[PDB]
Structure formats: structure tokens, C-alpha cells
Amino acid sequence: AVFQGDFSESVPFLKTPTNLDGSLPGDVGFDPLGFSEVFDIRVLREAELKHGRIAMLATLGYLVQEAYVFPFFDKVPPIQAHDVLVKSGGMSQILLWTSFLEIFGGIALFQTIQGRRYPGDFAFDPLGLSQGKNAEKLERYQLAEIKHSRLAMLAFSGFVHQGFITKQGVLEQLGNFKPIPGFPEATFF
Amino acid sequence: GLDGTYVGDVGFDPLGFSSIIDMRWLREAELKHGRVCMLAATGMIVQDVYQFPGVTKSFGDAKMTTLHDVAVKQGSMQQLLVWLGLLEIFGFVAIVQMLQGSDRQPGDFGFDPLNCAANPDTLARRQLVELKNGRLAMIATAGMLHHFFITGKGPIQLIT
Amino acid sequence: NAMPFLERPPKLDGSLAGDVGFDPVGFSNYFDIRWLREAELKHGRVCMLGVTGLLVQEAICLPQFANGKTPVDDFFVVPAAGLWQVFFTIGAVEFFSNGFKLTPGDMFSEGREAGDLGFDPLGCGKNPDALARRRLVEVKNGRLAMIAFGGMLHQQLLTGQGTLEQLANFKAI
Ligand code: CLA
Ligand code: CLA
Ligand code: CLA
Ligand code: KC2
Ligand SMILES: CC1=C(C#C/C(C)=C/C=C/C(C)=C/C=C/C=C(C)/C=C/C=C(\C)C#CC2=C(C)C[C@@H](O)CC2(C)C)C(C)(C)C[C@H](O)C1
Ligand SMILES: CC1=C(C#C/C(C)=C/C=C/C(C)=C/C=C/C=C(C)/C=C/C=C(\C)C#CC2=C(C)C[C@@H](O)CC2(C)C)C(C)(C)C[C@H](O)C1
Ligand SMILES: CC1=CCCC(C)(C)[C@H]1/C=C/C(C)=C/C=C/C(C)=C/C=C/C=C(C)/C=C/C=C(C)/C=C/C1=C(C)CCCC1(C)C
């Protein structure tokens, strides 16, 4: 805001979102269309983390699935694997167990709505990372988790879409990089 | 409805647009059209003089509007719509925040990378320049395109 | 407690054996703990015999009754009469024990504790300290028996091998 004004850190032009405060981790203040105003921030935070935690595993997997396949499973481009496993019924097994865990999760969301638990804490810290000795680290880690999650969700999105246009696997695209098919060759007119 | 405070006010609103529409909107619009037209005019003139490295082969000689009809097939135009649209959604938030009471003045996105407006006085002179060049640019762009429609010729070519 | 995240269910209390506070769904809030406790022991007790039966029956068949390729098949190869005879014998045992107080409100109206049929023909409930520990062992083995039976049976219906047999040749789908 070249003219002086009170304003949000991430975007100079817009005012700091109301009810958006530094307290949730990773708050650069960017909620340009308030969603936080329409729905509670804690319910939204639970979503950012859940999507992210799902995404972070997915980014690793799409890359790992390209390089390696468990021997019992066939090696196919990952998007194809979902079709193979869905016929196999492997995906139903992932769906059933993930749903069971989610039902416990849905109860915890209801508690998050009624005070009680902080968004996204399932108290899953089997290892001692951020243990009471390491309790200082939790604030820092929280920031990393949102940041890794925000990035992963963008990255997976990218890997899958880029892969559809290129028809080229992400590791392969890196090492051999080509324009979307036909562009060097094609003339629009 | 027209008062001295807006920069560039010579008092010219014959059709009384100011009376029906918030000036803040009208101004944000005049600058936005102007900023786009200035770039458009520059581009149309640049395009005739130079082209990026592989461009001529894919598009050939099409220029001005014809290039757009050819460009859309490349998808160069789409990338431009998607990215420009993403900037615009923030721009819609900006107009909304400004229309809701807010600090931002119409047309201010906070882009001053070289700190050119740091002096308060110099900024005012620059603001008048920006509306005036922009008002000219829009007139020019329209002219170049109409000239194109009728002559089928790029503006530098028409001069040639 | 069992779910760290959720608050421990209120009606759950340390008194019942094997209360780890695991009622995320909170059915206990809605229904009496005793009625549920009776069902949990009763499903667990029926299952304990269930698992024992699946293992025994594949190995042993009455000369009197025909044998099925699977313990599950043995239920089918048995005459129709046998099932209905047993079904009635079992129902009566329910009647005698519950004193005809079968419905949830009726049962327990005259005390009866929870899930107690007063069956200790061999006297083992003589000492209280063992009886608690015995209650915890009973409920844990009953829940384990519920899960195992479901597994032994579903694998048998699917594969068709016997539970002991399935170990000898896994033959995964
Ligand atoms: C722990 C419980 C459990 C059990 C009993 C099963 C059972 C099964 N799963 Mg698995 N699964 C589970 C949890 C479980 N799932 C979880 C939590 C996930 C992640 C969400 C998955 C993800 C998954 C996928 C992605 C797939 C399956 C498939 C299958 C089926 C094929 C079995 C097989 O590969 O041949 C027999 C198994 C082997 C030869 C592998 C070796 C297993 C060793 C010998 C046993 C070790 C103990 C075992 C893991 C039990 C753990 C619990 C125990 C310690 C108490 C089978 C019905 C597949 C399917 O649908 O079939 C096509 C499939 O593609 N599952
Ligand atoms: C679209 C461009 C645009 C816009 C939004 C404005 C807006 C404004 N001008 Mg600027 N102006 C422009 C172009 C523009 N001007 C050009 C090209 C010139 C040079 C000729 C000027 C010269 C000028 C002077 C000298 C002054 C203004 C002033 C003003 C303000 C009050 C005038 C008013 O109420 O009318 C608003 C203007 C319009 C509504 C434009 C109407 C254009 C035609 C007639 C509309 C026809 C309908 C249209 C084709 C439908 C299609 C729309 C569709 C694409 C969505 C206002 C902020 C005054 C000021 O600063 O006050 C503070 C002032 O003194 N203007
Ligand atoms: C959930 C329990 C359950 C159910 C529904 C069945 C059902 C069946 N069994 Mg199996 N069986 C069971 C438990 C069970 N059994 C147990 C625990 C054993 C080990 C002793 C056996 C051993 C067994 C054999 C060896 C055979 C069967 C057979 C059969 C079928 C004919 C009925 C019969 O002859 O009963 C047989 C019943 C018994 C031998 C004992 C009754 C089971 C328990 C102990 C009754 C509980 C009553 C009471 C509440 C417990 C208090 C006493 C306690 C001290 C034990 C039928 C499908 C026959 C068949 O079809 O095979 C081809 C057959 O040959 N069963
Ligand atoms: C960032 C500056 C830049 C811009 C903004 C830009 C825009 C466009 C557009 C937009 C409308 C099209 C459609 C287009 C098309 C092609 N470009 Mg080009 N291009 C740029 C830079 C380079 C470089 C550095 C190279 C290059 C090439 C090619 C080839 C190759 C195959 C061919 O020649 O058939 C084709 C088809 C390579 C080459 O071989 O050039 C002779 C090469 O080295 N470009 N290019
Ligand atoms: C914040 C903010 C804003 C914003 C914003 C934005 C930009 C929001 C963008 C959000 C995005 C992009 C969220 C993306 C989530 C992606 C996920 C969860 C991926 C899941 C993948 C899975 C489950 C998978 C998989 C797979 C695997 C792993 C491998 C395969 O073999 C199989 C399979 C395909 C199944 C704006 C201004 C708009 C408004 C606002 O005022 C505030
Ligand atoms: C924000 C922030 C941080 C950050 C960050 C980062 C690093 C963000 C990076 C974001 C990026 C790179 C986003 C990229 C968007 C690209 C798009 C939408 C392309 C669309 C293509 C289209 C529409 C097309 C097309 C088409 C064309 C052209 C023609 C057709 O023939 C073909 C085709 C269909 C392909 C982090 C987490 C570090 C921390 C922090 O807490 C906050
Ligand atoms: C009449 C009839 C019909 C046809 C003929 C017939 C077959 C002879 C007869 C028999 C019918 C019969 C008797 C059919 C028998 C049917 C049965 C007993 C099915 C049991 C299903 C149990 C399941 C799915 C338990 C899953 C456990 C889980 C998810 C554990 C979760 C866990 C929890 C909660 C806590 C810790 C975390 C984990 C470890 C995750």
C-alpha cells in the first residue's frame, strides 16, 4: 500500500482478515476472500491439516511408485494403479481402514467445534519428537507442517496434472524435459 | 459528483457517470483500462518490430487480432487468461475491501519495487502522468486495432 | 485413555473390569451400562465356544452326524431337526437364567448384578481377588473370541479350508 495504511502482511493491499489472528500456526494473514468469516477458523484448520497430511504422503508415493513397485504388485504408471487396485479390491481395503480411522476422527472434529481439542491434534506423537523435553520444538514444527502441507498439496496437484499433459512420469520429465506434445512442431497458422 | 480530490480532475463528466457509480470504482477502472492499454499498445508496436525466438514458425505472419485467433489454439492465450484471472481474483478482493471501508486508494496495488514514489510530491506528478498516458493509450490502442481492421496492416507496417 | 484425543466417556468408570474408557461413539451415554455389559459378556461367552467349536468340529465329527468339508458346512450337513432342537434348548436356558426378565427394563429389575447367571457349579468364584482378575481375563478373552470367530468363519466361508488347514496351505486369493 504505497499510500500509508494499516494492512495485511502477505498482501499489502488488503486489511488483516478479521477473526484471523497470529495464533494459528503459519498465519501470514492471507485469506483474501474471507472463508474464515463464513466458517470457523478451527474447523477450516482441521481441513488444511487433513488435506495436507493426506497430500504429503501422496507426493512421496507418486514419486516412490514411479521408481519402485512392491514385487507382488505390477509396476504401472500410478494413475493406472488406482484402476488396477480398484478392480483388485485393494483400494476398497484402503478405503475401509481409512474410513474406520476417519470415524474416530469425525467425533474429534465435533469436540473441536465444541471447544475441547485444538484443531488437528490427535495426540499422535509415538516418537519423542516434540516430547516434553522437546516441547519447545512443537511451535516450530507446527509451522513446518502447515508449510510442508501447503506445498505438498500444490506439488501433487502439479505432478498429476503435468503427468497427464506430458504423458511423461515426473522423474522422467525432470531428466528428459520436453514441451507439451506438438508445440515445437505445430503451427496454429 | 465530481470533486477536486481525485487526481486528473479537469471536471469533464458530460454524461454524468459519476452521479450513478462510485468514483472509487470509476477510477479503479480508468486506471486498470489504462494500465492494460499502455501495455497493449506497447505490445502491438513491439510485436511488429521483434518476435520471441520460436514464435514466427508456430504462428507465422498473423498479427494483431488475427494473431489472437491463432494464439488461442497454441493455448498461449489460455495461460494468459488463467494467470491474469488469478491476479484479478485478488483484484476483486481489493475492490471489495476498498468499497467496504478500507485504506487502499483506487488503483493502488502496492507495486513500487524501485521505491519511485517514496517522495510524496513526486508521486502526485506521476499519478497525473499515469492517467494521461493511459487515457492516450486507450485512444491509441483502439485506433491501432481499427486501423488494422480496415487496412489489414500492423501499425509500424502502416507507418512503413 | 484409549482415545487420547476424545474426552473419556463419562458413564464409563473404572468399576467395570477392562474399562479403558473406550466408548468414542458414546453408546453408553444412550443405553444402560449393565444392559450392554450383559450383551458384551454374552456375545463374548457364545464366541469363546464358537471359536472352540470351529477348531473342534473340523477335527472331530459325531459318528451320529454327517461331516462338512468346512466346520461351517457341518451346520448345513446336520439334520434340520438338530438346529431347531438346539435353538429351543438355548432359548429355555435364556428363560431360566433371566427368570423371564428378558426385556432390557425387566432384566436386572431384581438386581442380578450385570452379566451374572449365578453359574459356578465348579466353585471357582470362592475368592474375591481372583474373581476380579478372572472378570478381566473373561472380558478380554471374550472380545478376542468375538474378533477371532468372525475371522475364522469368514476365512472358512471364503477359502473353504479349515482354520487349522488354512495355516498348512495359505493359498492366498
Ligand atoms: C490388520 C488388518 C488387516 C487385514 C487382516 C487385511 C486383510 C487384507 N488386505 Mg489389507 N490393509 C490393512 C489392514 C488389513 N488388511 C490396512 C490398515 C491397510 C491400509 C489402509 C491395508 C491396505 C491394503 C491394500 C492396499 C490391499 C490390502 C489387501 C488385503 C487382502 C488380501 C490379503 C493378502 O494380500 O494376502 C495375504 C497377505 C499376505 C500374503 C501378506 C503377508 C501378511 C503376513 C503374513 C501377516 C502379518 C500379520 C497381518 C498383517 C495381520 C496384522 C494384524 C495382527 C498383527 C493382529 C486381505 C483381505 C489387498 C486386496 O484388496 O486384495 C487384492 C490389497 O491390495 N490391504
Ligand atoms: C473507460 C475509461 C475511463 C473511465 C472509467 C473514466 C472515469 C473517470 N474519468 Mg476519465 N477519461 C477517459 C477514460 C475514462 N475515464 C479518457 C479516454 C479521457 C480522455 C478523453 C478521459 C478524460 C478525463 C478528464 C479530463 C476527467 C476525467 C474524469 C473522470 C471521472 C469522472 C468522469 C465520469 O463520471 O465519467 C466516467 C467515465 C465513463 C463512464 C466513461 C464513458 C465512456 C463511454 C461514453 C461509455 C459508453 C458505454 C460503453 C461503451 C459500454 C461498454 C462497457 C463494457 C465494455 C463493460 C471518472 C473517475 C474527471 C475527473 O478526474 O474527476 C475526478 C476529469 O476531470 N476523465
Ligand atoms: C457357539 C457354540 C456352538 C454352536 C452353535 C455349535 C453348533 C453345532 N455343533 Mg459344535 N461344539 C461347540 C460349540 C458349538 N457348536 C463346542 C464348544 C464344542 C467342543 C466340545 C463343539 C464340538 C462339536 C462336535 C464334536 C460336533 C459339533 C456339532 C455341531 C452341530 C450339531 C449340534 C451338536 O451336536 O452339538 C454338539 C454340542 C456339544 C458337543 C457341546 C455343546 C456346546 C456347549 C458346551 C454347550 C453350552 C451349554 C452351556 C451354556 C455351557 C455350560 C456347560 C459348560 C461346563 C461346558 C452344530 C452345527 C457336530 C457336527 O455337526 O459336526 C459334524 C459334531 O460332530 N460340535
Ligand atoms: C522466454 C523467451 C521466449 C518466449 C516468450 C517464447 C514464446 C514462444 C511462443 C509464444 C507464443 C511460441 C509458440 C514459441 C514457439 C517455439 N519456441 Mg519460443 N519463446 C521464447 C524463447 C525461446 C528459446 C530460447 C527457444 C525457443 C524455441 C521454440 C521452438 C522450437 C522448435 C521450432 O523451432 O520449431 C518453438 C516452436 C527453441 C528453438 O528451437 O528456437 C528456434 C529455443 O531454443 N523459444 N515460443
Ligand atoms: C488460502 C486462501 C486462498 C487459497 C487457496 C488454495 C490455493 C487452495 C488449494 C488447495 C489445494 C490444492 C488442496 C489440494 C489438496 C490435494 C490433496 C489433498 C491431494 C490428495 C491426494 C490423494 C488423496 C491421492 C492420491 C494417489 C496417490 C497418492 C498415488 C496414485 O497411485 C493413487 C492416488 C491417485 C489415489 C484464497 C485466496 C483462494 C481464498 C482465501 O481467502 C484464502
Ligand atoms: C504461499 C506460501 C508458500 C509458498 C509457495 C509456492 C512455492 C507456490 C507455488 C505456486 C504455483 C507454482 C502455482 C502454480 C500454478 C500453475 C497453474 C495454476 C497452471 C495452470 C495451467 C493452466 C490453467 C493451463 C493450461 C493449458 C494451456 C496453457 C493450453 C492447453 O493447450 C493445455 C493446458 C491445459 C496445459 C509456502 C508454503 C512456502 C509457505 C507459506 O506458508 C505461504
Ligand atoms: C445363521 C448363519 C448364516 C449362514 C450360515 C452360517 C454361516 C452357519 C450361520 C452363521 C452366522 C454367523 C455366526 C456369522 C458371524 C458373523 C460375525 C461374528 C462377524 C464378525 C465381524 C467382526 C468384525 C468385522 C470386527 C472387526 C474388528 C475391528 C475392525 C477391530 C478394531 C480395533 C478396535 C475397535 C480397537 C483397537 C483397534 C482395532 C484393532 C482397529
CB of A166 closer than 8 Å to CB of A173: yes
Residue C143 half-sphere exposure, CB side, CA atoms within 13 Å? 9
3-state secondary structure at position C139: helix
* Cα–Cα dist C47/C63, whole Å: 25
* Cα–Cα dist B63/B154, whole Å: 7
Angle ∠(A84,A85,A86) on CA atoms, nearest 5: 90
CB of B38 closer than 8 Å to CB of B139: no
Q: How far is the CA of B134 from the centre of ligand 2 (A)?
A: 11
CB of C54 closer than 8 Å to CB of C43: no
Classify the C-alpha dihedral A30-A34-A37-A39 as positive or negative.
Answer: negative
Give the distance, in angstroms, between the CA of residue A90 and the centroid of all CA atoms in the same chain.
23
Crossing angle of helices B76-99 and B64-74, in 10° steps, is 100
Q: DSSP secondary-structure letter at B104?
A: P
Residue of chain B whose Cα is closest to the Cα of A34:
B93
Q: Please tell me the experimental approach by which this structure was elucidated.
A: cryo-EM
Give the ranges where B2-159 is alpha helix by DSSP (H). Answer: 17-20, 23-49, 55-59, 64-74, 76-99, 120-151, 155-159
Buried b (16+ CB within 10 A) or exposed e, C26-63: eebeeeebbbbbbebbebbbebbebbebbbebbeeeee
CB of A17 closer than 8 Å to CB of A6: no
CB contact under 8 A, A123 and C25: no
Q: DSSP secondary-structure letter at A157?
A: H
- Mutation probe of ligand 1 site: the residue of A74, A76, A93, A94 with most atoms within 8 A of C-beta: A93
B55 residue type, one letter: V
Helix (H) or strand (E) holding C89: helix C80-98
CB contact under 8 A, A13 and B90: yes
Which residue of C1, C6, C170 to mutate against A (max A Cβ within 10 Å)? Answer: C6
CB of C74 closer than 8 Å to CB of C163: no
CB contact under 8 A, B58 and A188: yes
Please report, in angstroms and rounded to a whole number, the separation of the first and last CA atoms in chain A: 44
Q: Read off the C-alpha cell for B144.
A: 491501432
Of A107, A116, A121, the CB nearest to C24: A107
Classify the C-alpha dihedral A175-A179-A184-A185 as positive or negative.
Answer: positive
Q: DSSP secondary-structure letter at C122?
A: S
Ligand 7 contacts CB of residue C72 (under 6 A): yes
Which protein residues are within 6 Å of ligand 2, measured from CB?
Answer: B 2, 6, 8-13, 15, 17-18, 23, 26-27, 29-30, 33, 135, 138-139
Task: Break chain A down into helix, strand, coil percent, rounded to 5.
Answer: 55, 0, 45
DSSP structure string for A12-80: SSSPPPTT--TTSSS-----SS-STTTS-HHHHHHHHHHHHHHHHHHHHHHHHHHH---SSSPP--HHH
Please list every residue in chain A whose beta carbon sits closer than 8 Å to the beta carbon of residue B112: 2
Q: Rg of the Cα trace of chain C?
A: 19
CB of B130 closer than 8 Å to CB of B39: no
CB of A131 closer than 8 Å to CB of A125: yes
Q: DSSP secondary-structure letter at A11?
A: S
Residue of chain A whose Cα is closest to the Cα of C1:
A123
CB contact under 8 A, B117 and A189: no
Ligand 6 contacts CB of residue A29 (under 6 A): no
Ligand nearest to the CA of A36: 5
CB contact under 8 A, A14 and B94: yes
Q: What is the 3-state secondary structure (H, E, C) of C22-77?
A: CCCCCHHHHCCHHHHHHHHHHHHHHHHHHHHHHHHHHHCCCCCCCCCCCHHHHHHH
Distances (CA, A) of A176 to A62, A65, A162, A171, C125: 18, 19, 14, 9, 76
* Cα–Cα dist B117/A63, whole Å: 48
**If we measure between CA atoms, which residue out of A4, A9, A44, A3 comes closest to residue A24?**
A44
For the CA of A85, the closest atom of ligand 1 is: 64
Ligand 5 contacts CB of residue A58 (under 6 A): yes
Residue whose Cα lies nearest atom 11 of ligand 3: it is C53
Please list every residue in chain B whose beta carbon sits closer than 8 Å to the beta carbon of residue A7: 103-104
